[PDB]
Enzyme design. Structure first.
Site, PDB file in Angstrom:
ATOM      1  N   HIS A  61       0.753  -3.220  -4.745  1.00 21.47           N
ATOM      2  CA  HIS A  61       0.944  -1.875  -4.203  1.00 21.47           C
ATOM      3  C   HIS A  61       2.434  -1.466  -4.258  1.00 21.47           C
ATOM      4  CE1 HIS A  61      -2.577  -3.752  -2.132  1.00 21.47           C
ATOM      5  NE2 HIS A  61      -3.124  -2.625  -2.565  1.00 21.47           N
ATOM      6  N   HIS A  91      10.820  -2.923   1.086  1.00 17.13           N
ATOM      7  CA  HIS A  91      10.070  -2.451  -0.096  1.00 17.13           C
ATOM      8  C   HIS A  91      10.389  -0.982  -0.251  1.00 17.13           C
ATOM      9  CE1 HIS A  91       7.567  -1.560   3.388  1.00 17.13           C
ATOM     10  NE2 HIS A  91       7.205  -0.466   2.716  1.00 17.13           N
ATOM     11  N   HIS A  93       8.698   2.954  -1.701  1.00 18.21           N
ATOM     12  CA  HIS A  93       7.621   3.808  -2.199  1.00 18.21           C
ATOM     13  C   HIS A  93       8.279   4.820  -3.149  1.00 18.21           C
ATOM     14  CE1 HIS A  93       4.860   2.657   1.196  1.00 18.21           C
ATOM     15  NE2 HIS A  93       6.027   2.386   1.762  1.00 18.21           N
ATOM     16  N   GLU A 103       7.763   9.245   1.283  1.00 19.29           N
ATOM     17  CA  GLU A 103       6.638   9.380   2.239  1.00 19.29           C
ATOM     18  C   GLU A 103       6.986  10.359   3.345  1.00 19.29           C
ATOM     19  OE1 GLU A 103       5.472   5.238   3.040  1.00 19.29           O
ATOM     20  OE2 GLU A 103       3.838   5.825   1.754  1.00 19.29           O
ATOM     21  N   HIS A 116      11.965   1.147   2.815  1.00 20.01           N
ATOM     22  CA  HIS A 116      11.497   0.749   4.139  1.00 20.01           C
ATOM     23  C   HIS A 116      11.973  -0.667   4.410  1.00 20.01           C
ATOM     24  CE1 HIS A 116       7.980   3.819   4.055  1.00 20.01           C
ATOM     25  NE2 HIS A 116       9.169   4.359   4.336  1.00 20.01           N
ATOM     26  N   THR A 195       2.459   2.814   6.696  1.00 20.85           N
ATOM     27  CA  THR A 195       1.959   3.908   5.833  1.00 20.85           C
ATOM     28  C   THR A 195       1.004   3.332   4.809  1.00 20.85           C
ATOM     29  OG1 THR A 195       3.851   3.578   4.298  1.00 20.85           O
ATOM     30  CG2 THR A 195       4.102   5.204   6.095  1.00 20.85           C
TER      31      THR A 195
HETATM   32  O1  LIG Z   1       4.405   0.274   3.324  1.00 19.13           O
HETATM   33  N1  LIG Z   1       4.406  -0.742   4.192  1.00 19.13           N
HETATM   34  C1  LIG Z   1       3.739  -1.927   3.877  1.00 19.13           C
HETATM   35  C2  LIG Z   1       3.738  -2.995   4.784  1.00 19.13           C
HETATM   36  C3  LIG Z   1       4.412  -2.874   6.016  1.00 19.13           C
HETATM   37  C4  LIG Z   1       4.410  -4.058   7.018  1.00 19.13           C
HETATM   38  F1  LIG Z   1       4.866  -3.668   8.134  1.00 19.13           F
HETATM   39  F2  LIG Z   1       3.146  -4.508   7.181  1.00 19.13           F
HETATM   40  F3  LIG Z   1       5.143  -5.000   6.566  1.00 19.13           F
HETATM   41  C5  LIG Z   1       5.055  -1.734   6.319  1.00 19.13           C
HETATM   42  C6  LIG Z   1       5.054  -0.623   5.373  1.00 19.13           C
HETATM   43  S1  LIG Z   1       5.878   0.839   5.758  1.00 19.13           S
HETATM   44 ZN   LIG Z   2       6.435   1.267   3.458  1.00 18.94          ZN
END
Ligand SMILES: On1ccc(C(F)(F)F)cc1=S
Ligand SMILES: [Zn+2]
Length: 257
Positions: A61, A91, A93, A103, A116, A195
């Site tokens: 993802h 990570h 987006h 986002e 993030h 998200t």
């Molecule tokens: O997008 N995303 C994916 C995973 C997580 C977590 F908190 F589970 F690590 C947070 C977010 S914003």
């Molecule tokens: Zn995220």
């Protein structure tokens, strides 16, 4: 399973994760004119000097840069937070085109990407117990715009060729996340959620006002990643963002006038 396509994308998630239509979902649009300045907010404290990165993973993802969170080594505190939150991973987006990807939006403006940095509240002992609590996570969100390159991002960009498909990982030690931060720590904050599924409502969001600039060549390299696994038809990893969700009964607070 869930994803970002027509048949498994954000408009479908509610069927497996009903909290998708919950009372504190993320992201949201930040209406700058109505986010009130809160003089009771404290400055944010980002203490990343001792961060220990370990590995980078394509999870199908996004890609996660993972940290050793077994000791208090890289922490976020202050701002809207009570207590201390430990960095576990960051990570991004991002979009297929520079005009979309973030986002959170700011007065409906979409940035090219959003970083993030995920942290868990150490009063809960580990991440798994923290995501069973309404104040279990703090995510620092930073917008990316396309312009000048960000030198501190290039070690991440240069490793992406080694993790092109879902399930691949690579050693990623000694990466310093300080090099991803803008100059200003002015932020907006509100209570929300992950998200991505499972969309858990654990998160104090802290979204920095100042974007960082990345080059068109850097973001182009994010868009060469794949959602699919090795040997499967190529599906470029682009547009892995959830659109803005209803604000409902929430106020977004500004740390700055
Ligand atoms: O997008 N995303 C994916 C995973 C997580 C977590 F908190 F589970 F690590 C947070 C977010 S914003
Ligand atoms: Zn995220």
């Amino acid at each position: 399973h869930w994803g970002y396509g027509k048949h498994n994308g954000p408009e479908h998630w509610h069927k497996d994760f009903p909290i998708a239509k919950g009372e504190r979902q993320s992201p949201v649009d930040i209406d700058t004119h109505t986010a009130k300045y809160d003089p009771s907010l404290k400055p944010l404290s980002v203490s990343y000097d001792q961060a220990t990165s370990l590995r980078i993973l394509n999870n199908g993802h996004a890609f996660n840069v993972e940290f050793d969170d077994s000791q208090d080594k890289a922490v976020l505190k202050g701002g809207p937070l009570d207590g201390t939150y430990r960095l576990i991973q960051f990570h991004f987006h991002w979009g297929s085109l520079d005009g979309q990807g973030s986002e959170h939006t700011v007065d409906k403006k979409k940035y090219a990407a959003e970083l993030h940095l995920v942290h868990w509240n150490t009063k809960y002992g580990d991440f798994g117990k923290a995501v069973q609590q309404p104040d279990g996570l703090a995510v620092l969100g930073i917008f990316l715009k396309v312009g000048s390159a960000k030198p501190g991002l290039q070690k991440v960009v240069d490793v992406l060729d080694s993790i092109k498909t879902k399930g691949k990982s690579a050693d990623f030690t000694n990466f310093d996340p300080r090099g991803l931060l803008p100059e200003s720590l002015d932020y907006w904050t509100y209570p929300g959620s992950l998200t991505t599924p499972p969309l858990l409502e654990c998160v104090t969001w802290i979204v920095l006002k100042e974007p960082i600039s990345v080059s068109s060549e850097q973001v182009l390299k994010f868009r060469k990643l794949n959602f699919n696994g090795e040997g499967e038809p190529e599906e470029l990893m682009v547009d892995n963002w959830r659109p803005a969700q209803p604000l409902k009964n929430r106020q977004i607070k500004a740390s700055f006038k």
